[PDB]
């Protein structure tokens, strides 16, 4: 669809470090260049190099090819929120089930929302998944370490954002509604969701889910969506024309002092007047979910595949 701040990365050496950038726009310019999945792959699976070469994040493979929230460059994926500190894409475990559907063959990284959070799978350097995804066989097309972005697969239609934390009573109220709505479900991804005197084995479960910032997610069938825009400082990226993201020192000056160029919308809330320029991020805004008479701004809203267990009694 196009990037937020920075065009696709053109890396030189796989051994080059990952300079961690605190500046928000700088953190999003890494996200545009998949420097975050690059880090995760390194931090969690002996991966030497980067993902996203030439293509960038705008080229990551999404399992639901009909991915709606991907067309919006500014809607954050699970991984993209891992870089900003909203969710940790936990490394997989022998018990974290890989969902069927995605063409895993050749993937270097892939990720899926799980009922209790987010889980990713990495392959080591010069390695790539099998068609089932549970091993990392050899792949001569991965020796470079400067791998394409198609080698990154993000499972599910997912949108992440700053969440209004909800009283825990709400969550439990929501979990109670999710249980009356989904009585057949006994477990989701290994997390108890109801009680059954007879449970069938794990089963693919395409479900609209929601992260309200609590233990598990709130899975949904009858729910309403609606998008907003707070025009807050996190919905605006800052950049120096031609030279990429503005420094952290320049950004705060832009988004506080108001002595910076910018789009209409920035100007109309922050101010304007060689210099730094800030703009809006490409997104409908913040997703608000109506559910069981209550609306909640989720940390992440989305429709994704999960492995769940249904009753037999």
């Amino acid at each position: 669809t196009g990037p937020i701040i920075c065009a696709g990365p053109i890396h030189s050496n796989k051994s080059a470090d990952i300079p961690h950038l605190l500046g928000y726009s700088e953190k999003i310019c890494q996200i545009d260049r998949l420097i975050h999945v690059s880090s995760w792959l390194r931090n969690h699976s002996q991966f030497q190099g980067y993902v996203g070469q030439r293509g960038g994040r705008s080229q990551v493979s999404y399992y639901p090819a009909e991915n709606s929230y991907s067309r919006w460059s500014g809607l954050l994926s699970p991984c993209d929120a891992d870089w900003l500190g909203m969710l940790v894409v936990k490394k997989a475990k022998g018990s974290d089930m890989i969902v069927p559907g995605p063409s895993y063959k050749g993937k270097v990284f892939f990720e899926r929302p799980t009922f209790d959070g987010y889980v990713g799978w990495g392959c080591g350097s010069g390695k790539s998944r099998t068609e089932s995804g549970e091993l990392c066989s050899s792949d001569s097309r991965t020796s470079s370490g400067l791998l394409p972005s198609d080698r990154v697969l993000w499972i599910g239609d997912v949108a992440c954002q700053p969440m209004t934390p909800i009283p825990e009573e709400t969550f439990l109220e929501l979990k109670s509604f999710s249980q009356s709505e989904f009585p057949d479900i006994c477990k989701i991804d290994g997390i108890v969701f109801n009680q059954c005197e007879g449970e069938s084995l794990p089963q693919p479960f395409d479900v609209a889910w929601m992260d309200v910032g609590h233990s598990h997610k709130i899975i949904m069938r009858e729910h309403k969506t609606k998008w907003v825009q707070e025009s807050s400082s996190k919905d605006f990226v800052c950049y120096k024309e031609g030279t990429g993201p503005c420094s952290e020192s320049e950004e705060k000056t832009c988004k506080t002092s108001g002595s910076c160029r910018g789009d209409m919308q920035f100007c109309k809330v922050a101010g304007c007047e060689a210099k730094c320029r800030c703009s809006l991020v490409h997104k409908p805004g913040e997703v608000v979910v109506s559910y069981g008479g209550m609306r909640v701004r989720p940390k992440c809203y989305g429709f994704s595949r999960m492995m769940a267990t249904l009753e037999v009694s």
Partner: antibody
């Protein structure tokens, strides 16, 4: 009570087409993956087609891949198997089933006889 | 694909007998999570296939305690501790751990005389 009732079975001509409809009642259709199973006259059961709950994923064995198309409208809580390129080897009682390695609820079946 | 071979194909049975139905798979029906999606179905004449056992040994509810499954790996077995007339029919084993899912050859429980 969990009830699946298939419909659309009858005589078809070789190479012709027939679509089977599975009407689902007594459960939350959209939270179950579903599948179609046939029984040849020699009483052999065969897995025919599978579909996720949201219809996004389908699977077939190469015996009926590209010839059949499974589909489901959760809105009407109905499962569908569009059968094309039919042959006398497609002579069977086609059952629809609540699915994923455990066909825990089956339909009454619908006889599809491919014969010129 | 995963060839499910069912022994016996025909099994003469008398009421009160305990009968065994063995199903041996070409490959290991243990996936990479230890989950084995092998299920046993009963198909009585003129009715629909009914799920008896799923997941090797877990009884579908509505199925009497006389039906029991067991096994691991390649060879799996269905066990009816006490045959009753309502159990006669064709019994099928079925994988689901690997695609394509494959049923077994079938076991006709017929009356021994």
């Amino acid at each position: 009570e969990v009830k699946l009732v298939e419909s659309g079975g009858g005589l078809v001509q070789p190479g012709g087409s027939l679509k089977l409809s599975c009407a689902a009642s007594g459960f939350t259709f959209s939270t179950y993956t579903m599948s179609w199973v046939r029984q040849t006259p020699e009483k052999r059961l065969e897995w025919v087609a599978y579909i996720s709950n949201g219809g996004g994923s389908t699977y077939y064995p190469d015996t009926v891949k590209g010839r059949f198309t499974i589909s489901r409208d959760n809105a009407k809580n109905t499962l569908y198997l569009q059968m094309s390129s039919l042959n006398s080897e497609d002579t069977a009682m086609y059952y629809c089933a609540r699915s994923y390695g455990n066909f825990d609820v089956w339909g009454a079946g619908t006889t599809v006889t491919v014969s010129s | 694909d995963v060839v499910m071979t069912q022994t016996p194909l025909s099994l003469p049975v008398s009421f009160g007998d305990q009968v065994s139905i063995s199903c041996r798979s070409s490959q290991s029906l243990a996936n990479s999570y230890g989950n084995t999606y092998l299920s046993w179905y009963l198909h009585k004449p003129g009715q629909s296939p009914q799920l008896l056992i799923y997941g090797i040994s877990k009884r579908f509810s509505g199925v009497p305690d006389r039906f029991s499954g067991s096994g691991s790996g390649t060879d799996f077995t269905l066990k009816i501790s006490t045959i009753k007339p309502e159990d006669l029919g064709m019994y099928y084993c079925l994988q689901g751990t690997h695609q394509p899912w494959t049923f077994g050859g079938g076991t006709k429980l017929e009356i021994k005389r």
